[PDB]
């Protein structure tokens, strides 16, 4: 093994659990607009975990732009540009 | 093994669980607009996990643009451009 | 093995579980517009996991644009362009 | 083995489970417009998992555009263009 | 083995399960417009998994456009074009 290496390794185990019954679950989701409502009856919850964004790795024994967007909000980007740019984010 | 390497390795186990019955589940989802409502009756929940975005890896013993968008919002992008650009994000 | 390598390896196991019965499931989904409502009765849930987006890998012992969009929102893109561009995102 | 390599390897097992009966499932889906409603009675759910988007891999011991869109929304794209472009996303 | 290689390998097993009977399934789907409603009575569900989109792979020891769209929404694309383009996405 020699050189660059980006490794994402996640080990998750949910095995050997007992959940008893007789449960009453009433879930009301209504009139949601541009939303992601989450809910429920859980015992073991593993979620939204293990995120890896790689980076610069240069191994040696013209405009470059690299953008990694994970679950993010990016608006109004003019990198390495020539001219005039107008970005208006007025909130009233 | 020699050179660049991007590896996504996820191991998940849900094996050996007991869920008892006699359960009452009433789920009401209505009048959702541009939404992703999530719910339910769960015991072991593994989700939205293990995301890997690769990066720059250069191994050596003109405009370049690389964009990785995972579950993201990207609006108004003019990288490495020449001229004039108008991006208007007014909210009233 | 020598050179670039992008590998997505996911191992998932749900084997050896017991789910008891006598369950009452009432699910009401109605009047959803441009929506993806999710629900149900679950014991072991593995979903929306294991996403890999490859990256730059250059092994050596004119406009280039590379865009990877996974479950994302991309609007108003003018990379490496010459001229004038108007992108209007007014919300009233 | 030598050179570029993009490999998607997913192993999923649901074998050896017991689901007891006597279940009552009432599912009501109606008046959905441009929607994908999901629901049901589940024990082991594996879905929407294991997505791989390849990337740049260059092995060496004029306008290029590469776009990978997986379950994404892309509107208003004018990469590597010359002229004037108007993209209007007004919401009222 | 030498050169570029894109391989999609998925192994899924659901073998050795017991599902007991005496079940009552009432499913009502009506008045859906431009929709894909999904539901039912399940034990082992494997679906919408294992998607691979290949990428750039160049092995060496004028306008090019490559677009891969999987279950995606692409509207208003004018890459590597000369002139004027109007794309109007007004929602009222």
Q: How far is C86 from chain B (nearest CA, A)?
A: 5
What is the distance between the alpha carbons of residues A65 and E7, in angstroms, rounded to a whole number?
A: 29
Q: Which two tokens stand for residue A72?
A: 């993010």
Q: Which two tokens stand for residue E61?
A: 């020891």
Find chain E residues with C-beta within 8 A of D81's C-beta: 78-82, 85
Mutate: best of C18, C40, C74, partner E, most E CBs <10 A: C40
Tallying the residues shown for chain D, one arrives at: 92
Q: Distance between terminal CA atoms of chain A? A: 57
Closest CA to C19 of A57, A17, E86, B81: A17
Closest CA to A57 of A10, A19, A2: A2
What is the distance between the alpha carbons of residues B35 and C36, in angstroms, rounded to a whole number?
A: 6
Residue located via tokens 């084997």: C15
Closest CA to D45 of E12, E46, C13, C16: E46
Cβ distance B61 to A61 less than 8 Å, yes or no, reads yes
DSSP state of A55: -
Q: Distance between terminal CA atoms of chain E? A: 57
CB E14 within 8 A of CB D12: no
Mutate: best of E8, E14, E55, E87, partner C, most C CBs <10 A: E55
Find chain D residues with C-beta within 8 A of B14's C-beta: 44
Cβ distance B12 to C17 less than 8 Å, yes or no, reads no
Residue located via tokens 């250059």: C58
What is the distance between the alpha carbons of residues D10 and A47, in angstroms, rounded to a whole number?
A: 19
Cβ distance D52 to E52 less than 8 Å, yes or no, reads yes
CB B15 within 8 A of CB C17: yes
Q: Distance between terminal CA atoms of chain C? A: 57
What is the distance between the alpha carbons of residues E28 and C22, in angstroms, rounded to a whole number?
A: 21
What is the distance between the alpha carbons of residues A60 and A55, in angstroms, rounded to a whole number?
A: 16
Read off φ and ψ for residue D20, nearest 5 degrees.
Answer: -80, 160
What is the distance between the alpha carbons of residues B11 and B4, in angstroms, rounded to a whole number?
A: 23
Cβ distance B14 to D44 less than 8 Å, yes or no, reads yes
- In sequence order, what are the residues at sequence separation of 6 or more whose Cβ sits closer than 8 angstroms to the Cβ of residue A22? B20, B22, B23
With an 8 Å CB cutoff and a minimum of 3 pairs, decide whether chains D and B touch.
Answer: yes
Resolution of the experimental structure, in angstroms:
3.1
Mutate: best of C55, C60, C88, partner A, most A CBs <10 A: C55
C-alpha pair distances (Å), B73 with each of A50, A76, C74: 20, 11, 6
Cβ distance C86 to B86 less than 8 Å, yes or no, reads yes
Strands D24-30 and E24-30: parallel
C-alpha pair distances (Å), A26 with each of A23, C22, E34: 10, 17, 29
Torsion of CA E56, A70, A54, C51, to 10 degrees: -60
What is the distance between the alpha carbons of residues A42 and D29, in angstroms, rounded to a whole number?
A: 25
- In sequence order, what are the residues at sequence separation of 6 or more whose Cβ sits closer than 8 angstroms to the Cβ of residue B53? A52, A53, A54, A68, A70, B68, B70, C52, C53, C55
Q: Which helix (H) or strand (E) holds E11?
A: strand E6-13
DSSP 3-state of C89: coil
C-alpha pair distances (Å), B76 with each of A66, C76, C78: 16, 5, 8
Cβ distance C39 to A27 less than 8 Å, yes or no, reads yes
Closest CA to C75 of A64, E64, E54, D88: D88
CB C25 within 8 A of CB E39: no
What is the distance between the alpha carbons of residues A68 and C51, in angstroms, rounded to a whole number?
A: 14
- Burial of E19-29, coded b for 16+ CB within 10 Å and e otherwise, reads beeebeeebeb
């Amino acid at each position: 093994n020699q050189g660059n290496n980006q490794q994402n390794y996640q080990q998750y185990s949910q095995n050997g659990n007992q959940q008893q019954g007789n449960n009453r679950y009433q879930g009301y989701q209504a009139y949601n607009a541009q939303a992601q409502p989450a809910g429920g009856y859980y015992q073991n919850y593993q979620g939204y975990s293990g995120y890896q964004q790689g980076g610069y790795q240069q191994y040696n024994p013209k405009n470059f732009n690299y953008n990694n967007n994970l679950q993010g909000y990016q608006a109004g980007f003019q990198p390495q540009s020539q001219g005039m740019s107008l970005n208006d984010f007025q909130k009233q």
